[PDB]
Scaffold this active site. Sequence first.
Site, PDB file in Angstrom:
ATOM      1  N   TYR A   1     -33.479 -30.728  68.398  1.00 30.44           N
ATOM      2  CA  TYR A   1     -34.334 -31.352  67.464  1.00 30.44           C
ATOM      3  C   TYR A   1     -34.245 -31.466  65.387  1.00 30.44           C
ATOM      4  CZ  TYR A   1     -37.148 -30.401  72.220  1.00 30.44           C
ATOM      5  OH  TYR A   1     -37.478 -30.085  72.781  1.00 30.44           O
TER       6      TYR A   1
ATOM      7  N   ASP B   1     -41.379 -23.622  71.890  1.00 38.19           N
ATOM      8  CA  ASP B   1     -40.196 -24.445  71.821  1.00 38.19           C
ATOM      9  C   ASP B   1     -39.250 -25.180  71.234  1.00 38.19           C
ATOM     10  OD1 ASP B   1     -39.444 -25.452  75.220  1.00 38.19           O
ATOM     11  OD2 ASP B   1     -39.859 -27.221  74.076  1.00 38.19           O
TER      12      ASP B   1
ATOM     13  N   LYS C   1     -32.846 -24.578  74.668  1.00 36.80           N
ATOM     14  CA  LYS C   1     -31.603 -25.371  75.429  1.00 36.80           C
ATOM     15  C   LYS C   1     -30.679 -26.027  74.503  1.00 36.80           C
ATOM     16  CE  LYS C   1     -37.327 -27.422  75.542  1.00 36.80           C
ATOM     17  NZ  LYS C   1     -36.686 -27.605  74.222  1.00 36.80           N
TER      18      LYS C   1
ATOM     19  N   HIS D   1     -31.023 -28.350  79.095  1.00 31.10           N
ATOM     20  CA  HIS D   1     -32.238 -29.463  79.003  1.00 31.10           C
ATOM     21  C   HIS D   1     -32.127 -30.530  79.698  1.00 31.10           C
ATOM     22  CE1 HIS D   1     -33.763 -30.365  74.204  1.00 31.10           C
ATOM     23  NE2 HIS D   1     -34.686 -31.796  75.163  1.00 31.10           N
TER      24      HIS D   1
ATOM     25  N   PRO E   1     -45.569 -16.916  77.274  1.00 31.36           N
ATOM     26  CA  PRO E   1     -47.170 -17.412  77.352  1.00 31.36           C
ATOM     27  C   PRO E   1     -47.417 -18.242  77.085  1.00 31.36           C
ATOM     28  CG  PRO E   1     -46.369 -15.822  75.811  1.00 31.36           C
ATOM     29  CD  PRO E   1     -45.512 -16.529  76.311  1.00 31.36           C
TER      30      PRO E   1
ATOM     31  N   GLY F   1     -38.931 -11.390  86.297  1.00 31.51           N
ATOM     32  CA  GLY F   1     -39.612  -9.845  85.596  1.00 31.51           C
ATOM     33  C   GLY F   1     -40.689  -9.862  84.577  1.00 31.51           C
ATOM     34  N   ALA F   2     -40.594 -11.348  83.525  1.00 32.33           N
ATOM     35  CA  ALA F   2     -41.395 -10.864  82.456  1.00 32.33           C
ATOM     36  C   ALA F   2     -42.327 -11.882  82.130  1.00 32.33           C
ATOM     37  CB  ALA F   2     -39.965 -11.252  81.119  1.00 32.33           C
TER      38      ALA F   2
ATOM     39  N   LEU G   1     -49.744 -20.787  76.661  1.00 36.89           N
ATOM     40  CA  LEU G   1     -49.208 -21.518  75.426  1.00 36.89           C
ATOM     41  C   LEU G   1     -48.555 -21.875  74.554  1.00 36.89           C
ATOM     42  CD1 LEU G   1     -50.801 -24.186  74.729  1.00 36.89           C
ATOM     43  CD2 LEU G   1     -52.562 -22.533  73.397  1.00 36.89           C
ATOM     44  N   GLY G   2     -47.613 -22.843  74.183  1.00 37.38           N
ATOM     45  CA  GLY G   2     -46.898 -22.731  72.924  1.00 37.38           C
ATOM     46  C   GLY G   2     -46.824 -24.059  72.368  1.00 37.38           C
ATOM     47  N   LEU G   3     -46.174 -23.685  71.078  1.00 37.31           N
ATOM     48  CA  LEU G   3     -45.678 -24.555  70.251  1.00 37.31           C
ATOM     49  C   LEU G   3     -44.760 -26.209  70.523  1.00 37.31           C
ATOM     50  CD1 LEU G   3     -46.881 -25.698  67.325  1.00 37.31           C
ATOM     51  CD2 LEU G   3     -45.765 -24.359  66.258  1.00 37.31           C
TER      52      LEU G   3
HETATM   53  N1  LIG Z   1     -37.474 -30.160  77.533  1.00 38.46           N
HETATM   54  C1  LIG Z   1     -37.818 -31.852  77.437  1.00 38.46           C
HETATM   55  O1  LIG Z   1     -36.844 -33.177  77.334  1.00 38.46           O
HETATM   56  C2  LIG Z   1     -38.687 -32.398  76.199  1.00 38.46           C
HETATM   57  C3  LIG Z   1     -39.673 -33.597  76.243  1.00 38.46           C
HETATM   58  C4  LIG Z   1     -39.875 -33.984  75.298  1.00 38.46           C
HETATM   59  C5  LIG Z   1     -40.882 -32.626  74.738  1.00 38.46           C
HETATM   60  N2  LIG Z   1     -40.742 -31.784  74.709  1.00 38.46           N
HETATM   61  C6  LIG Z   1     -41.419 -30.298  74.150  1.00 38.46           C
HETATM   62  O2  LIG Z   1     -42.536 -30.402  74.908  1.00 38.46           O
HETATM   63  C7  LIG Z   1     -43.658 -31.130  73.350  1.00 38.46           C
HETATM   64  C8  LIG Z   1     -44.651 -31.197  73.034  1.00 38.46           C
HETATM   65  O3  LIG Z   1     -44.579 -32.677  73.268  1.00 38.46           O
HETATM   66  P1  LIG Z   1     -44.303 -34.105  72.646  1.00 38.46           P
HETATM   67  O4  LIG Z   1     -43.887 -33.428  71.543  1.00 38.46           O
HETATM   68  O5  LIG Z   1     -43.156 -35.058  73.134  1.00 38.46           O
HETATM   69  O6  LIG Z   1     -45.360 -34.874  72.213  1.00 38.46           O
HETATM   70  P2  LIG Z   1     -47.347 -34.222  72.823  1.00 38.46           P
HETATM   71  O7  LIG Z   1     -47.229 -32.533  71.925  1.00 38.46           O
HETATM   72  O8  LIG Z   1     -47.597 -34.912  73.904  1.00 38.46           O
HETATM   73  O9  LIG Z   1     -47.762 -34.991  71.028  1.00 38.46           O
HETATM   74  C9  LIG Z   1     -47.670 -34.948  69.982  1.00 38.46           C
HETATM   75  C10 LIG Z   1     -48.500 -35.461  69.578  1.00 38.46           C
HETATM   76  O10 LIG Z   1     -49.880 -34.890  69.393  1.00 38.46           O
HETATM   77  C11 LIG Z   1     -50.318 -35.275  68.196  1.00 38.46           C
HETATM   78  N3  LIG Z   1     -51.122 -33.980  68.119  1.00 38.46           N
HETATM   79  C12 LIG Z   1     -51.459 -32.743  68.261  1.00 38.46           C
HETATM   80  N4  LIG Z   1     -52.379 -32.334  68.507  1.00 38.46           N
HETATM   81  C13 LIG Z   1     -53.026 -33.143  68.696  1.00 38.46           C
HETATM   82  C14 LIG Z   1     -54.434 -33.278  68.855  1.00 38.46           C
HETATM   83  N5  LIG Z   1     -55.194 -31.977  68.713  1.00 38.46           N
HETATM   84  N6  LIG Z   1     -55.058 -34.014  67.872  1.00 38.46           N
HETATM   85  C15 LIG Z   1     -54.878 -35.668  67.795  1.00 38.46           C
HETATM   86  N7  LIG Z   1     -53.204 -35.336  67.847  1.00 38.46           N
HETATM   87  C16 LIG Z   1     -52.671 -34.521  68.043  1.00 38.46           C
HETATM   88  C17 LIG Z   1     -49.444 -34.890  66.898  1.00 38.46           C
HETATM   89  O11 LIG Z   1     -49.232 -35.198  65.654  1.00 38.46           O
HETATM   90  P3  LIG Z   1     -49.056 -34.098  64.007  1.00 38.46           P
HETATM   91  O12 LIG Z   1     -47.489 -33.808  64.060  1.00 38.46           O
HETATM   92  O13 LIG Z   1     -49.067 -35.148  63.482  1.00 38.46           O
HETATM   93  O14 LIG Z   1     -50.511 -33.113  64.634  1.00 38.46           O
HETATM   94  C18 LIG Z   1     -48.316 -35.636  67.812  1.00 38.46           C
HETATM   95  O15 LIG Z   1     -48.019 -37.028  66.793  1.00 38.46           O
HETATM   96  C19 LIG Z   1     -41.779 -31.067  72.222  1.00 38.46           C
HETATM   97  O16 LIG Z   1     -42.658 -30.733  70.635  1.00 38.46           O
HETATM   98  C20 LIG Z   1     -40.950 -30.424  72.876  1.00 38.46           C
HETATM   99  O17 LIG Z   1     -41.050 -29.067  72.457  1.00 38.46           O
HETATM  100  C21 LIG Z   1     -39.948 -31.398  76.131  1.00 38.46           C
HETATM  101  O1  LIG Z   2     -34.617 -34.123  74.961  1.00 38.07           O
HETATM  102  C1  LIG Z   2     -36.201 -34.017  74.430  1.00 38.07           C
HETATM  103  O2  LIG Z   2     -36.270 -32.549  74.209  1.00 38.07           O
HETATM  104  C2  LIG Z   2     -37.054 -35.091  73.798  1.00 38.07           C
HETATM  105  C3  LIG Z   2     -35.751 -36.086  73.523  1.00 38.07           C
HETATM  106  N1  LIG Z   2     -36.689 -36.771  74.561  1.00 38.07           N
HETATM  107  N2  LIG Z   2     -35.567 -38.488  74.590  1.00 38.07           N
HETATM  108  C4  LIG Z   2     -35.455 -39.780  75.213  1.00 38.07           C
HETATM  109  C5  LIG Z   2     -34.439 -39.125  76.573  1.00 38.07           C
HETATM  110  N3  LIG Z   2     -34.179 -39.122  77.890  1.00 38.07           N
HETATM  111  C6  LIG Z   2     -33.245 -38.402  78.913  1.00 38.07           C
HETATM  112  C7  LIG Z   2     -32.596 -39.072  79.712  1.00 38.07           C
HETATM  113  C8  LIG Z   2     -31.612 -37.629  80.408  1.00 38.07           C
HETATM  114  C9  LIG Z   2     -31.467 -37.912  81.841  1.00 38.07           C
HETATM  115  F1  LIG Z   2     -31.074 -37.219  81.874  1.00 38.07           F
HETATM  116  F2  LIG Z   2     -31.993 -38.726  81.887  1.00 38.07           F
HETATM  117  F3  LIG Z   2     -30.232 -38.707  81.517  1.00 38.07           F
HETATM  118  C10 LIG Z   2     -31.063 -37.740  79.213  1.00 38.07           C
HETATM  119  C11 LIG Z   2     -31.073 -37.501  78.041  1.00 38.07           C
HETATM  120  C12 LIG Z   2     -33.187 -37.636  77.915  1.00 38.07           C
HETATM  121  S1  LIG Z   2     -33.047 -37.945  75.911  1.00 38.07           S
HETATM  122  C13 LIG Z   2     -34.577 -38.929  73.413  1.00 38.07           C
HETATM  123  O3  LIG Z   2     -34.156 -39.680  73.306  1.00 38.07           O
HETATM  124  C14 LIG Z   2     -34.485 -37.638  72.632  1.00 38.07           C
HETATM  125  C15 LIG Z   2     -33.904 -38.044  71.408  1.00 38.07           C
HETATM  126  C16 LIG Z   2     -34.024 -37.410  70.337  1.00 38.07           C
HETATM  127  C17 LIG Z   2     -34.038 -35.864  70.244  1.00 38.07           C
HETATM  128  C18 LIG Z   2     -35.220 -35.398  71.601  1.00 38.07           C
HETATM  129  C19 LIG Z   2     -35.027 -36.394  72.468  1.00 38.07           C
END
Ligand SMILES: NC(=O)c1ccc[n+]([C@@H]2O[C@H](COP(=O)([O-])OP(=O)(O)OC[C@H]3O[C@@H](n4cnc5c(N)ncnc54)[C@H](OP(=O)(O)O)[C@@H]3O)[C@@H](O)[C@H]2O)c1
Ligand SMILES: O=C(O)Cc1nn(Cc2nc3cc(C(F)(F)F)ccc3s2)c(=O)c2ccccc12
Length: 315
Positions: A48, A43, A77, A110, A13, A9-10, A15-17
Amino acid sequence: ASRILLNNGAKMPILGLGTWKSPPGQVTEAVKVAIDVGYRHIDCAHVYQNENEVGVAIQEKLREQVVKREELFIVSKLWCTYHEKGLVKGACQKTLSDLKLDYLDLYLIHWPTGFKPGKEFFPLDESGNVVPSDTNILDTWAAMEELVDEGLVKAIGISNFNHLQVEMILNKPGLKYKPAVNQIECHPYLTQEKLIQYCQSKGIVVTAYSPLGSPDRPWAKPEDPSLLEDPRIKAIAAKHNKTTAQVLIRFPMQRNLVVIPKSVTPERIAENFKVFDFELSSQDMTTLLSYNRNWRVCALLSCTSHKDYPFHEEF
Ligand SMILES: NC(=O)c1ccc[n+]([C@@H]2O[C@H](COP(=O)([O-])OP(=O)(O)OC[C@H]3O[C@@H](n4cnc5c(N)ncnc54)[C@H](OP(=O)(O)O)[C@@H]3O)[C@@H](O)[C@H]2O)c1
Ligand SMILES: O=C(O)Cc1nn(Cc2nc3cc(C(F)(F)F)ccc3s2)c(=O)c2ccccc12
């Protein structure tokens, strides 16, 4: 529209950072700039290693009355080494304390894989294999449900869960709260059509990570495909008088996804938010989908024998 309705129910946004890899000495100002120019979703993750500094920025903008807590949507996460039922609350509370919040809007598992508890985030054996924990997805999920019932989190969800793992929770015996979100890697080289349709068909919202292809990922290699430099995407952008990054951010938006680009560059933080003023055509959308190549930023080799590794599975 700027928000999407979740199954708790919430509204979230769209777009997030992102804050993975944002250095601790630059992310406070990054988050301040972001709230100042319109972002209301951040996010985060324990893993991290920068939640304290993120929190400083949130608290200052709250103190300054730039935004109200209600208007912010703060995501964190639960890391792999805290999947045990007895560790989940403390993990969440550490995250809350660091972010200097009294609740999270969304807390995710996560990764589906549990790792041995300890101070090491990636505990390895002498041959470099991650050491699993014997916890399973369903007991972790019940621990997440308890966090809602204790008011520490408004919504719970999952990240990097394949369709069979999502299905495992949806079929969980005695399921109390469905996942609200599945956060997965998603961009034109990894389009995820099947997993996205499955999740949306179940009223689960999908968040796209690495939407720009994570050019600052520390394991990047020369031969890797590069979205931001792909002439075909550059061309679509040129057509729209927008940057390539703007097109890559707008693309998931038009698939009803949440998208969370990372930057610590103030000009880019602002650039990335100016994506509500233009539209990709349906043809553009299908053309971007055509660039799928099943390429993943995030799929760490040391984890691929974990029982619950999610990416053997087609989806
Ligand atoms: N759930 C998970 O396992 C998981 C895994 C990976 C990522 N995530 C989340 O997703 C977020 C985004 O993914 P990401 O950090 O992997 O990569 P991304 O957002 O795809 O790319 C970030 C990179 O893009 C550059 N950048 C940003 N805006 C730009 C623009 N307008 N033009 C050119 N370059 C630009 C940044 O440089 P600068 O910073 O130098 O500007 C940085 O090097 C993460 O930070 C994290 O919050 C979650
Ligand atoms: O985690 C982030 O948000 C970004 C992220 N990704 N990865 C690549 C990864 N690949 C995985 C695969 C599994 C698996 F489930 F597949 F086993 C489990 C855990 C991971 S971490 C990293 O190694 C990592 C290290 C430090 C901080 C953030 C990250």
